[PDB]
Amino acid sequence: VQLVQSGAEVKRPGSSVTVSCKASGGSFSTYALSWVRQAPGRGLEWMGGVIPLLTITNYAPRFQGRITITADRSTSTAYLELNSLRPEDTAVYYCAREGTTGSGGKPIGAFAHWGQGTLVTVSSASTKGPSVFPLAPSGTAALGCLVKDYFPEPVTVSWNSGALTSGVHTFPAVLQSSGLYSLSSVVTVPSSSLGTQTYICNVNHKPSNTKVDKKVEP
Amino acid sequence: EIVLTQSPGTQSLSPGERATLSCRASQSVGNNKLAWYQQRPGQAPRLLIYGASSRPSGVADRFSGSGSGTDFTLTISRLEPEDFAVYYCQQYGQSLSTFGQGTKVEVKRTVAAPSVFIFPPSDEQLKSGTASVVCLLNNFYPREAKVQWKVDNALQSGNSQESVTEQDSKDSTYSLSSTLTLSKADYEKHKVYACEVTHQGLSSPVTKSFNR
């Protein structure tokens, strides 16, 4: 059983989002499919589920009035609709299907099968590429790059095209009052290397096609 | 609504040690429909135990579940490196399913004070009308740390943000980055930019600073 979700989406406040979950393997119609979300740095929250053959939904009271979960047996696809979006709805949304036990397909209720998740970002911001600024080094020195003012997630950072990983720390982004993200990436190295070795941070922000290879020097 | 309490929310343990994680329910869980999941950073959760004590075929037998009613336990007989992760309990004994808040099992190591670095704004950024000052607290343990920004000794509020890395897989430390942001014009009103750091490994606060 494999569950494959639709891709990340940015939604405006007050809008409605639809996330899909396509199942392949086993039977679709007779097993319970639920939606579980996780806001950034927070825990898992069960939202609701559906049993497709019976068209019986079951919604958490917190979402009853804003959620619709549907199932299309012809495509083995389940859908989550969530309305009246607010910034608090920014989260990774997972579909999760109950497991089975034994050889006869007996269901277990608990969620054995999970999709990859879908990040839904609720924001009024527009796509923006970051500026990339050096954090210049002053037996160990620190140096880094500041990747400032981008939207939406994600940004990836490497150093020296992936050759430098020891001592690298790439931090979680923070969301600024502007509704744009900022992140930093740093590395510590021997002070004696600063004269001779080159350090370059490779920043990739796909949505804006920002690809910067910033040499950081003393 | 059944409230599931996972306490403590963090356990600091060593590889090879046993772990027992508590899930207490505010009401009896119907038919012991209590599941446990593991979640590592950047990954979907994974089912370890269902029906309080049943273990899916694929799951390591060092994980076991027990308990009934309102009092459930996940036991990890011997912690492997990959077992340091977050564990959630979930009840599904009534139509409103709920999860606990999770318990993070992290690696205990010796106390390590942060190495502290401060970075002035780049010339490039200053040309653009903004000044970001960065403070790095590197490779410390435990995770609890505090940074305060002071500008000519005035404590700052509302103009900084920070974040923290996941525990390092090799040395079991954390690092933290904080950014203070001002307009260029405001940045140019002040001289001394300081970050003051508090941590268990420091007998008194450490300040790194520069003069604009």
Binding site: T30, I56, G104 | K33, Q94, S95
Partner: peptide, 15 residues
């Protein structure tokens, strides 16, 4: 309990 429905369904659909 909604979480028990599919077990019932499984049981009655066996032959």
């Amino acid at each position: 309990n909604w979480f028990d429905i599919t077990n019932w369904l499984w049981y009655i659909k066996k032959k």
